[PDB]
Write a protein that binds this ligand. Sequence first.
Ligand SMILES: O[C@@H]1[C@@H](O)[C@H](O)OC[C@H]1O
Ligand SMILES: [Ca+2]
Length: 330
Amino acid sequence: AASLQALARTAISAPLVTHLYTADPSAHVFDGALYIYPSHDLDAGHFDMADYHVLRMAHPGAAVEDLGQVLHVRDVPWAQRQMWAPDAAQRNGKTYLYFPAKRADGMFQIGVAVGDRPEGPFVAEPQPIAGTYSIDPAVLADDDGAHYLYFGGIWGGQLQHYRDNAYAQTHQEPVGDAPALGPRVARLHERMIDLAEPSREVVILDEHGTPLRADDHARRFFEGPWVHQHAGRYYLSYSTGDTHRICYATSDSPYGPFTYQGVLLAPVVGWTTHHSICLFQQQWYLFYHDSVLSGGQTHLRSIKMAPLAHAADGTIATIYPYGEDAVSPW
Ligand SMILES: O[C@@H]1[C@@H](O)[C@H](O)OC[C@H]1O
Ligand SMILES: [Ca+2]
């Protein structure tokens, strides 16, 4: 109402684009430029996305280019609907677009599409990646040359229906003192369109080295994992869903276990929160989204960016998207 107008006035970022609704930004530096692979929210006059665009910043501070639509669900034979939060990777001169979509039978899986350029167009594989399920893929290009796929989202994302990579209708989200579910991780094969191994659960620990509890909604994993490397450590960051933050944890291994550190992003306007963290020349950035452009509509978002800093001790200061003095939307 007027509480949202206050946030709009003190927002630290403006929508990087406004001619289309965008969400779940996955930022990468490919071929000397910053490419962003977001979802494309559609306004039906309800997360029913059907296609993906690719955005680019040629250099820091540059205007954002909309490189156009690069993949539509009609060219994904195994998928019926809901083209959700994607990501990209490069290897052997190819660019791969990883995306979650829903099969006709209602189950999410992660597919991949291949192109010869970062802007595509991408030709989707006929089937989804074997061993994948749930949503929100993130592909880490490790400094050592390997690529790792991270995925998972609870609630609507369906990760709660799986244990040890197998689906069960009676599998539900854990409660109380039971450990909360973590994202999945699997090294990718050199061909990039297949996993090189079955995925494993990524464990997030508290200050005492104990796994996060299911009843710890302030810190336990909800959706949208992202991993970046900095100062010899792996940083796992993710959304907490119902508590609306992007939190992060650290490990000396891409597989974890990751020890919880703190909140990386405070609550944004709109129920969902999703992000990526990417180094572009002289600056790390947090890419995120909110629903301010749409007037607070959770399903119609816009992506944003902000400078991010690692402190000398490796920690990352909380980013307040409408200022630290703002009344939090959640
Ligand atoms: O993947 C995103 C998902 O994490 C969120 O739940 O809803 C929007 C999707 O785009
Ligand atoms: Ca993501």
